[PDB]
Design a protein around this ligand. Sequence first.
Ligand SMILES: [Zn+2]
Ligand SMILES: [Zn+2]
Length: 64
Amino acid sequence: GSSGSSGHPMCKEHEDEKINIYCLTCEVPTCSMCKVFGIHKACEVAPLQSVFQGQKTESGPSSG
Ligand SMILES: [Zn+2]
Ligand SMILES: [Zn+2]
């Protein structure tokens, strides 16, 4: 009706990969390998741990 069971979102690229970090730009909970070794470079990932206000992305250049 309205309520129901729901699991955790898994990275689209890696069907079998427990999400480690969460993306902001696109607003999608993706892994880190996709951010450091993927297309999620220009995006802004944060420490899923807490994910407090303010960006924490310094290491890693941003591509077009
Ligand atoms: Zn992204
Ligand atoms: Zn991934």
